[PDB]
Design a protein around this ligand. Structure first.
Ligand SMILES: *[C@@H]1O[C@H](CO)[C@@H](O)[C@H](O)[C@H]1NC(C)=O
Ligand SMILES: *[C@H]1O[C@H](CO)[C@@H](O)[C@H](O)[C@H]1NC(C)=O
Ligand SMILES: [K+]
Length: 194
């Protein structure tokens, strides 16, 4: 029960969700019941480290960001001993297959310089830049399959699932809250599994 409807904040204290803050207004699905209620990757992470990121690609990263900072349904995957992330450390979140497949396809035309986006950046300038010796290449050079993209980009925060949206066994990065949060059932399912 402790694993359900729970947030870890930027001081690494567990706290309840609440109405979404102003900074996360674009995180629509979470307007009612959010952990984002700053350290936000809505602006503190340079998506354009290798030229302009394509808008179709950038959308997925906004979703990814919203899910990480706002979702009260990642409790089963939160590693409480790890306080090294800006908020929670999650491990092997069962991301829905098509969310990962779409994200991969949509980022084909963008570029990046490394596979693990959680470490190894140069931050000297006040924002993240590719380090000396990290060559910009097509996105799929660093992420040749949706599996490598989803599993490696945030160092195993996600583990892409064989399940698809609607199964109740995978976490999706976005949804229409007017028909309820579909990740709620998934958290409860894995809380029980554990
Ligand atoms: C960090 O940024 C600047 C050049 O971009 C430089 O002072 C330093 O060498 C950089 N660090 C590395 C190894 O990229
Ligand atoms: C694959 O994932 C699990 C693990 O084997 C399995 O139980 C499930 O039936 C499969 N999912 C689907 C529907 O492909
Ligand atoms: K959620």
């Amino acid at each position: 029960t402790e694993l359900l409807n729970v947030c870890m904040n930027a001081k690494h204290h567990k706290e309840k969700p609440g109405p979404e803050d102003k900074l996360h207004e674009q995180c629509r699905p979470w307007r009612k019941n959010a952990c984002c209620s700053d350290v936000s990757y809505l602006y503190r992470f340079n998506w354009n480290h290798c030229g302009e990121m394509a808008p179709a690609c950038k959308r997925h990263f906004i979703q990814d960001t919203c899910l990480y900072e706002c979702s009260p349904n990642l409790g089963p995957w939160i590693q409480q001993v790890d306080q090294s992330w800006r908020k929670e450390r999650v491990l092997n979140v069962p991301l829905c297959k098509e969310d990962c497949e779409q994200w991969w396809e949509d980022c084909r035309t963008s570029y990046t310089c490394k596979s693990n986006w959680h470490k190894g950046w140069n931050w000297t300038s006040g924002f993240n830049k590719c380090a000396v010796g990290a060559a910009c290449q097509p996105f799929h050079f660093y992420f040749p399959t949706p599996t490598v993209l989803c599993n490696e980009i945030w160092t195993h925060s996600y583990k892409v699932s064989n399940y698809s949206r609607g199964s109740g066994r995978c976490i999706q990065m976005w949804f229409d809250p007017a028909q309820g949060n579909p990740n709620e059932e998934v958290a409860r399912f894995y809380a029980a599994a554990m």
